[PDB]
Amino acid sequence: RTKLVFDDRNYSADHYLQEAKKLKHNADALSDRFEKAVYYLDAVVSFIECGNALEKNASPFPMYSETVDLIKYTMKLKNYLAPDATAADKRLTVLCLRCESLLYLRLFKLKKENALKYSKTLTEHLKNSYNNSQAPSPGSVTIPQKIHQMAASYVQVTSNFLYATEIWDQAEQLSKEQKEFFAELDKVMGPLIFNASIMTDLVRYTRQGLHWLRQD
Amino acid sequence: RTKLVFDDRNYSADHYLQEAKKLKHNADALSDRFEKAVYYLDAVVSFIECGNALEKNASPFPMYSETVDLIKYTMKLKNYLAPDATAADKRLTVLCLRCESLLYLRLFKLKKENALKYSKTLTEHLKNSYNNSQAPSPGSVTIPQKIHQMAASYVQVTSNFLYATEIWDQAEQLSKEQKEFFAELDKVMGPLIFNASIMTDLVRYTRQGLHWLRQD
């Protein structure tokens, strides 16, 4: 067993993008699904590195979103639920799901401000509009279109961590099935922490796991 | 320094409630704010223990919600932002904010199912209702009241982890100001993990911190 030693020379968001694109076009031009997915996942981490480098001198939202799309494509390659699925396929899938979960959670986190005060005004008006459509009794609803767009966007950015939570839990569950591989990987890297691991932690974790997979 | 040894005999949700209520009525009848808050926080953990015991033979939602209310009351006692605020006040506040954060996150988590498919239907209709209020051009909005109630509830349960995230981050920030006390507490208990620590982990963590505070 060997641990990657990691270069601290942080580059420009541009450098990681041609890295990612090259790994990805390397993936695009190969036969064996497994092979493809590995390179796709390597491409993915370079894409993540690029987004991280955007966040250093401030927007990474599009880059991250499209990266989660490339992760779903990749997972649909050697589907871990297939009955022939190998341990390698399942470990690959786990790494994919960690990247996808924490990516979703970052996509959210970029719009946390929006989400919070949107929640305030929305809670207020989703009571005003309702109290005003019901004639009192002594003894469809119509909303301002601003309120409507604010509802649309609130659901938009809250969806991202609904996905993050659910996918995080799939990663944990499927990880129990490769308890040893991921026990050792958590040993040498430290385990990923939902809400605490930054993008560089994820990048290195994923790189190390990809390294062991390519070594078999 | 001494670590509490913890009793594994899990009791009924009823047993913890009269424990909590007794600690709380002990708090209610004392002068010194600090004193009060300590007992309030002890009351709180018994209240949490009670809610946990509800979850064992399946609803803890009300109990948890009202407990977070007792936590905000308690924090409004020796406000850590006061200029006379002691290290003890600040540590107490940190413990309060962990309980409040993870309580919010559980309140959410109880309704995760609701939230997810609500997100689906809401995203669809928040496009149907909008595409149908805008006359096309070749070259306020009205919604079903079911959709309206679903929007209200979706915002309701997503608010809970918006709070959980924000309060979690306040706890981290204020924790940097008592880095050593909480470094040692994480040492002997293991640190609380957002999204991973279960209620019993929180109970024991908080109990241990309360123990050191009462020892000064």
Author numbering:
A (entry chain A), B (entry chain A): 903 to 960, 965 to 994, 995A, 996 to 1045, 1082 to 1158
The authors write:
The crystal structure of human AFF4-THD was determined by Se-SAD, and the structure was refined with native data to 2.4 Å resolution. Only one molecule of AFF-THD presents in the asymmetric unit though the AFF-THD was eluted at a volume consistent with dimer from a gel filtration column. Most residues were localized clearly, except for the highly flexible loop from G1045 to S1082 as well as the very N- and C-terminal residues. The structure of AFF-THD is comprised of eight alpha helices, of which α2, α3, α6 (Ala1116–Ala1120), α7, and α8 constitute a ring with α4 located in the center. The α1 helix, with a highly dynamic N-terminal loop standing out of the ring, packs along α2 in the manner of a helix–turn–helix fold. Together, those helices mentioned above constitute the tetratrico peptide repeat like domain (TPRL). α5 and the N-terminal portion of α6 (Gln1087 to Asn1102) sticks out of the TPRL domain, which resembles a handle of TPRL domain and is referred to as Handle Region (HR) hereafter. Although the sequence of AFF4-TPRL is not predicted as TPRs, AFF4-TPRL arranges in a fold that resembles three TPRs with α8 posing in the concave groove. In contrast, AFF4-TPRL contributes its last helix to fill the hydrophobic cleft formed by AFF4-TPRL, a novel protein fold. Though only one AFF-THD was visualized in the asymmetric unit, analytical gel filtration indicated that AFF-THD is a dimer in solution. As shown in the model, the dimerization of AFF-THD is mediated mainly by α5, and α6 (Ser1082 to T1107), as well as part of α4. Our crystal structure shows that two hydrophobic cores, with Phe1014 and Tyr1096 located in the centers, respectively, mediate the formation of an AFF4 dimer.
AFF1/4 is an intrinsic disordered scaffold protein that ties together the other components of the SEC. SEC is composed of the positive elongation factor b (P-TEFb) including cyclin-dependent kinase 9 and Cyclin T (CycT1/2), the transcription factor ELL1/210,11, the scaffold protein AFF1/47,8,10, and ENL/AF9. To release Pol II from this pause, HIV-1 trans-activator protein (Tat) recruits the super elongation complex (SEC) to the TAR RNA. Although the three binding sites of AFF4 that bind to its partners in SEC have been well defined, the structure of its C-terminal homology domain (hereafter referred to as THD) of AFF4 has not been solved.
